[PDB]
Amino acid sequence: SGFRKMAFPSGKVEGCMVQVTCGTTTLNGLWLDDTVYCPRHVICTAEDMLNPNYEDLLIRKSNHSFLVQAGNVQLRVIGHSMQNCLLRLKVDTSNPKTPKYKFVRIQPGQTFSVLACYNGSPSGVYQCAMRPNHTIKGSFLNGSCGSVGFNIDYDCVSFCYMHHMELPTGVHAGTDLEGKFYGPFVDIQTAQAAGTDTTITLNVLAWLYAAVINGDRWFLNRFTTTLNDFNLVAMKYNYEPLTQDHVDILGPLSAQTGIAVLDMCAALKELLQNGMNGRTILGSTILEDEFTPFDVVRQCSGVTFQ
Numbered sequence: 105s106g107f108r109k110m111a112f113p114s115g116k117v118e119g120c121m122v123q124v125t126c127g128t129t130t131l132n133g134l135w136l137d138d139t140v141y142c143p144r145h146v147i148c149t150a151e152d153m154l155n156p157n158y159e160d161l162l163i164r165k166s167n168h169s170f171l172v173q174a175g176n177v178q179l180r181v182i183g184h185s186m187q188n189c190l191l192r193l194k195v196d197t198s199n200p201k202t203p204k205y206k207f208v209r210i211q212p213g214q215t216f217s218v219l220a221c222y223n224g225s226p227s228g229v230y231q232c233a234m235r236p237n238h239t240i241k242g243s244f245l246n247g248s249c250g251s252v253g254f255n256i257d258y259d260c261v262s263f264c265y266m267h268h269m270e271l272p273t274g275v276h277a278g279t280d281l282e283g284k285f286y287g288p289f290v291d292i293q294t295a296q297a298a299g300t301d302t303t304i305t306l307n308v309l310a311w312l313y314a315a316v317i318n319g320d321r322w323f324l325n326r327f328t329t330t331l332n333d334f335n336l337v338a339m340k341y342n343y344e345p346l347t348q349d350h351v352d353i354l355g356p357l358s359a360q361t362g363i364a365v366l367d368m369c370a371a372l373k374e375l376l377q378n379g380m381n382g383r384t385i386l387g388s389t390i391l392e393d394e395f396t397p398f399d400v401v402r403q404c405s406g407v408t409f410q
C-alpha cells in the first residue's frame with residue numbers, strides 16, 4: 105500500500121553523465137556510445153547569450169575548444185556538429201556503460217524522472233510532469249543544464265528531456281534529445297514567459313482511480329455525466345477538456361475498479377464544485393495531476409482493495 109511520486113532507478117543514466125567545458129562555461133552532457141550531447145549554449149558567455157548567433161559562434165570553435173571529462177578521465181573530442189539546440193560531440197571512446205536507449209519526444213501531461221547533475225556529477229533525482237504550457241516544475245540551480253529527463257521500460261532508457269533554462273516564474277524549459285525545444289522557447293535571453301497552464305484532467309482521474317485501488321471511495325457519487333457537460337464544468341475550473349481518447353485510456357483502471365470513466369468524471373465534477381470537505385485523498389488535501397494512467401498501473405496493486 106501507500107502512494108508516492110516515484111522515479112525510475114537512476115543508475116543507467118548516472119553512468120552516462122559527463123562534464124563539458126567550453127572556455128569558462130561548464131555544464132553537463134550525456135555520453136552514449138561515442139557521442140556526447142549537450143546544450144549548445146555551452147559555447148556562449150554571459151555577453152553572447154541575449155543575442156547570440158550559434159552558427160557563427162560555432163564555426164569559430166575547434167574540437168579542442170571542448171573539454172570532456174568522464175569522472176577524472178579526459179575524453180578527447182574528434183568531431184562536433186550542431187543539431188537544433190544541441191551539440192553532438194564525437195569522442196575517441198565509446199561509453200562502456202551505454203544502456204539500451206532511444207530518444208522520445210514526450211507529450212504534454214506525460215511524466216519522466218530527472219537526474220539533476222552538477223559538473224558531470226549526479227546529485228539527485230525527482231519525478232516531473234510535462235506541463236500543458238510546456239514547462240516543468242523542476243528543482244534546478246545554475247550549472248544544472250544538460251541534466252536529463254527519462255523513462256525506463258525493461259532495460260531501455262527512453263531519454264526525453266535535457267535542461268537548458270529557467271524562466272522568470274522559476275519553472276524550467278528544455279529540449280528533447282534531437283535539440284528541439286518543448287514549447288515556444290528559445291535559448292536566448294529574451295522576454296519569454298510561461299504561458300497560462302491548465303490542470304491535467306487525465307491524470308487527476310487516474311489518481312482518483314488510484315485512491316479506489318488502495319481502498320478509498322468517499323468521493324464517489326450516484327450520478328453520471330455526459331462527456332460534454334463535464335467539459336463545460338472542466339473549463340470553469342481550468343482543467344483540460346476530456347476527450348474520448350482520454351476516456352479510452354482509462355479503460356483498464358475503470359475495469360480494475362468497476363467505476364465507469366464518466367461516473368468518475370461525475371465524481372470529479374462534484375469535487376470541483378464542492379471541495380474536499382477538509383478531507384484527503386491518498387494523503388493529499390488537493391487534487392493531484394502529476395501521475396499518469398501508466399504511473400498508476402505501474403505502482404498500484406493489480407488487485408483492488410475490496
Ligand SMILES: *C(=O)[C@H](Cc1cnc[nH]1)NC[C@H]1C[C@@H]2CCCC[C@H]2CN1C(=O)CCNc1ccccc1
Pocket residue numbers: 131145150153244245246247248249250267268269270290291292293294
Ligand atoms: C543551466 O546551466 C543554467 C540554467 C538554469 C539555472 N537554474 C536553473 N536553470 N544555464 C542558464 C544560462 C543559459 C540560459 C540560456 C537561455 C537564455 C538565458 C540563459 C541564462 N543563463 C545564465 O546563466 C544566466 C544567469 N546569470 C548569471 C549572472 C552572473 C553569473 C552567472 C550567471
